[PDB]
Amino acid sequence: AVVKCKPTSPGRRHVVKVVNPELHKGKPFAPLLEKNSKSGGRNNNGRITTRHIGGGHKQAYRIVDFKRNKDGIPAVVERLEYDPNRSANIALVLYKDGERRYILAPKGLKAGDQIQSGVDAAIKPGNTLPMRNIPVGSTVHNVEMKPGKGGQLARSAGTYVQIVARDGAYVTLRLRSGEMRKVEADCRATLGEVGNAEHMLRVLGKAGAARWRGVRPTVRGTAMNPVDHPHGGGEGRNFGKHPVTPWGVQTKGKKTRSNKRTDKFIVRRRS
């Protein structure tokens, strides 16, 4: 799990990486690998719309199906795999019919466990089923917001959601952000919680460690020139202004929540 290397050299001192001996060492399943081309945060116009992105190591897209449409077919997990794109770990499952797909590895999952989807699945980790059959107060992950959408909520490493209420056609879920949001009861969700919860304790250790992950250096606003940022200028590290974005939007307090279309789903906004 969490291990801290010895300070053999500067930059290797504060290095703490998370090791997992259960992870399959070897080339992944070819039939599920679409190529992925990074852009470094440049759109069709080619301009840097999302700064600080670029470089890194070449990654291949792992086609993981979180839509989970196969119902009633029992499937045993062949093995677990490391995903360069995800934050958690993917698990190569194999359906009885002879079809292999990827899924987010829950906490209680082993290379041999058997999960399935449908309305008659057993209340066990990794099983996906309509929230109208899930017992209130339980914990699930990879939840959809639209029936047959695919699953947007709770899909990060060591993350989950808490199903609380069920008033007829709706279900009140307590998101991990400490917020109560309603959702159609007929949405599917994998029961359990996302594994690899120790990903959080991982400390990069060195500058290059963040660079090859795909993140370019961030320049502080107070260092730029008056034309480059609302901050900066002056002589020596003097601020004098109210913190804002490089474009002039008040930061540290300004609530940018402006949708109104999905407002009647937010039961209790996070605080």
Which two tokens mark 166?
């069920």
- The distance of closest approach from Cβ of residue 105 to RNA in the complex, given in angstroms and rounded to an integer, is 20
CA dihedral of residues 241, 49, 86, 65 (deg, nearest 10) = 130
Tell which one of 200, 213, 242, 245 touches RNA (CB under 7 A).
200
- The distance of closest approach from Cβ of residue 66 to RNA in the complex, given in angstroms and rounded to an integer, is 24
Which two tokens mark 48?
């840097």
Which two tokens mark 231?
């901050």
175 binds RNA (CB under 7 A): no
Range in contact with RNA (rule: CB under 7 A) among 17-25, 109-117, 146-154, 161-169: 161-169
CB closer to RNA out of 42 and 124: 124
> Cα(49)–Cα(47) distance, rounded to whole angstroms?
6
Residues 124-143 interacting with RNA (rule: CB under 7 A): 136-137
Which two tokens mark 6?
């010895």
CB closer to RNA out of 63 and 136: 136
Q: Quote the Cα angle for 84-214-64, to 5°.
A: 25
162 binds RNA (CB under 7 A): yes
CB closer to RNA out of 119 and 136: 136
Beta bridge partners of 131: none
Tell which one of 94, 164, 210, 244 touches RNA (CB under 7 A).
164
Residues 6 or more apart in contact with residue 154 via CB below 8 angstroms: 140, 141, 142, 143, 160, 161, 175, 176, 194
Tell which one of 201, 220, 239, 249 touches RNA (CB under 7 A).
201
Give the number of residues in contact with RNA, rule: CB under 7 A: 10
Q: Are 212 and 155 in contact (CB under 8 A)?
A: no
Q: What's the N-to-C CA distance of the chain in angstroms?
A: 33
268 binds RNA (CB under 7 A): yes
216 binds RNA (CB under 7 A): no
Residue whose C-alpha is closest to residue 83's, from 42, 41, 43, 36: 36
Range in contact with RNA (rule: CB under 7 A) among 53-61, 84-92, 93-101, 158-166: 158-166
Tell which one of 124, 174, 206, 211 touches RNA (CB under 7 A).
174
Binding site for RNA (CB under 7 A): 136-137, 162, 164-165, 174, 178, 200-201, 268
